[PDB]
Amino acid sequence: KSPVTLIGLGPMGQAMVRTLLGQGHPVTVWNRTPSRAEPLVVEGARLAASPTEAVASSDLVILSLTDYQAMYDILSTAESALAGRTIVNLSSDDPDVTREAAKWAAKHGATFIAGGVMTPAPTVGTEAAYVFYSGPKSAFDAHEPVLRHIGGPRFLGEDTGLAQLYYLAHLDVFLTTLASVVHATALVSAAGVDEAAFAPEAIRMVIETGQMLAAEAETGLELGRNLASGNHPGELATAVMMGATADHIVSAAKGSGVDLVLPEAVKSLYDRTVAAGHGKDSWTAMYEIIKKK
Amino acid sequence: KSPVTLIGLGPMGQAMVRTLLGQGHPVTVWNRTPSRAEPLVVEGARLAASPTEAVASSDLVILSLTDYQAMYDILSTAESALAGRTIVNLSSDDPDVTREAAKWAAKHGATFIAGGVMTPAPTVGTEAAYVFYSGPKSAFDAHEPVLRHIGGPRFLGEDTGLAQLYYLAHLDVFLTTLASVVHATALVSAAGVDEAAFAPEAIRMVIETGQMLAAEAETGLELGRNLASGNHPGELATAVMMGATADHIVSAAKGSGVDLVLPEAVKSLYDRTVAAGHGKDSWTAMYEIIKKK
Ligand SMILES: [Cl-]
Ligand SMILES: [Cl-]
Ligand SMILES: [N+]
Ligand SMILES: [N+]
Ligand code: NA
Ligand code: NA
Structure with missing residues (x-):
């Protein structure tokens, strides 16, 4: 009224x-x-x-x-x-x-x-x-x-700035995830593959990533627990193992003429996480590189 | 046997x-x-x-x-x-x-x-x-x-290199999406918010992004269609609009002392997409910047 x-x-x-x-x-x-x-x-x-x-x-x-x-x-x-x-x-x-x-x-x-x-x-x-x-x-x-x-x-x-901080952090995930779907499709299509053949698979990979993160299982990754506690136990997804894959993505993109800024940013995160001594820790240890000092 | x-x-x-x-x-x-x-x-x-x-x-x-x-x-x-x-x-x-x-x-x-x-x-x-x-x-x-x-x-x-090209392109989505969840949590936690409070929301944003991309609806985005056809019709998600948001994420990260390489890579994609004349086109027009010449 x-x-x-x-x-x-x-x-x-x-x-x-x-x-x-x-x-x-x-x-x-x-x-x-x-x-x-x-x-x-x-x-x-x-x-x-x-x-x-x-x-x-x-x-x-x-x-x-x-x-x-x-x-x-x-x-x-x-x-x-x-x-x-x-x-x-x-x-x-x-x-x-x-x-x-x-x-x-x-x-x-x-x-x-x-x-x-x-x-x-x-x-x-x-x-x-x-x-x-x-x-x-x-x-x-x-x-x-x-x-x-x-x-x-x-x-x-009661901090006025929180609404847009949370909004932009959500859009941080949104824009970066979307850019990676386009980048991955470009990586494959540079070989001559029809973009329409691979884009649905890149999209399914987003869905699968979200399912993995939300995993119901007790043995699955507890992302918020790692970041909140500062403990990044290395299971089968260590920073040095996933950083090696980040390196292969950069070399694949470099070899096929696909733009490098996005995969080089990911490689930079892994490179610095390993160089800080977290190679045998979970990939979530990149949080210690990213976070405010 | x-x-x-x-x-x-x-x-x-x-x-x-x-x-x-x-x-x-x-x-x-x-x-x-x-x-x-x-x-x-x-x-x-x-x-x-x-x-x-x-x-x-x-x-x-x-x-x-x-x-x-x-x-x-x-x-x-x-x-x-x-x-x-x-x-x-x-x-x-x-x-x-x-x-x-x-x-x-x-x-x-x-x-x-x-x-x-x-x-x-x-x-x-x-x-x-x-x-x-x-x-x-x-x-x-x-x-x-x-x-x-x-x-x-x-x-x-029958190209031997296809299996790892497709594998690394899937991991391109995986690693980049995961890095963005950690980066977004760092952006919010720099304000004092408990990492355990926000990480589940960043994860839900991945799930929501995948749902949007896979959308069932006829009016929804057809990502593979845009990339395969080279036509990037600007609806309500243009490159200039989403690039403005990418700019706000970079300034938010810069202001709070959170690492910049990942959001600056996204901003670089949008900056160059707009500078190439695609500002009024869909954000998917960044494909024309990323793809092999
Ligand atoms: Cl994991
Ligand atoms: Cl869209
Ligand atoms: N202002
Ligand atoms: N080789
Ligand atoms: Na071995
Ligand atoms: Na206005």
Whole structure:
């Protein structure tokens, strides 16, 4: 029932406005290009005349924009209207950038919560969606009914930067895993193999890797246990054994003219893990090379 | 029923000997350290006195060793015994190294097949196992009954180097995906978060990435189609959008003191994909940067 303002009418913003309207919230919108609001107005949203009018329409302002610079640019003329309101910014950006935004919000009398939407826009309003939130817990609690309708809110803690830290760490896995599927297909296709023949196998290897990591079995790898305890017991997957394979991938890529930066990064991790004395330890010992000193 | 020689009694070799013995094959073994043969002899294997005697015991010689250099070293004294036999080498190595081994085998009158065991040793002899093979198809066919008992043989073609090319491309996905899970956990734990809290989420992200790639849906990404056709239609996952996220991961890692080589490799792929004019294309357009010219 409580009114909401949403600025940024890309695919995520449109799905959130449709969902919130369907749950009976009055929704005021604003966008750099007003034509994108027209379908939302037909569904019952109100188009604000300016960012100031948009901000003044609700106690809760949700931002879905390309980055935090877009928030500063759009809200520049509305800064004096921010006092007493809560900004929930769902845009992706560097964690320290989001922490600086919390200082700017406070300067203008606004409460600030950062969010990170973990699932695609089609999941908004369903059981599949989930969104990280961080910032003052009392603010999260005050607006939880709205955030619940968007889908699967997960409060992480009262450091504003946590939502984008967790978001970018998830995207760290996503982007790197996806790059490796393309790189592996290139390695094989350089020999003349049809890309369509091998890409499904590279995809199955991702699935198999995830199954192995999640293994149900007591004898299987316990990755979080190794990293949390600092003990990396070498079983049948040691750093020196897997590093040898990393070396063979680099030589295979070098021999076939396939780009080297990705496999050389993996080889660098294994090279330094072995050089630090962890050769007989688990490959998970690369954590001791990667982690903050 | 046909006799087999197996050299290299690490975990994979031991599982293969146990399986082949259980199917009624006479199995002759040899190992650099004879003590590792003792359990296999109790199960019914015969321990050969030398590599020459091992090779002379069977028409089929299976090698399970750390690399191809170990094959040359072990079989040096047995080279004159190789004539008329088939070597199946299941050891991992660079594809061109395996092609050079096919020349050496031919020089000594032996047929040569390369294999790549894709599943862990506990899967040997079961429906879960599968092993790539490459080399002369007539040789594969002549020994297929033995290879069938080892588990899921997959003939790839008559280029000896294919088995290890496919193996290393699978391990390309495996090692890179695993490194990203550790890197992502380090990114979050640098903020003080318990590694045991976040590692399960990084693992779930691998599973989710594999599900997305294998998507059942008609609207979902068709990775193999993009790479095979050379058409990378930009939907909601463009190279410029995902490259911006790659940039944020690099700045987050730089700010928290977490190692940069892996996220900088991903950023390098996206940077060059955008700089080549593919910014509005799918992220899969990085294939045009990675692939052999
Ligand atoms: Cl492991
Ligand atoms: Cl995609
Ligand atoms: N900033
Ligand atoms: N070689
Ligand atoms: Na924007
Ligand atoms: Na060996």
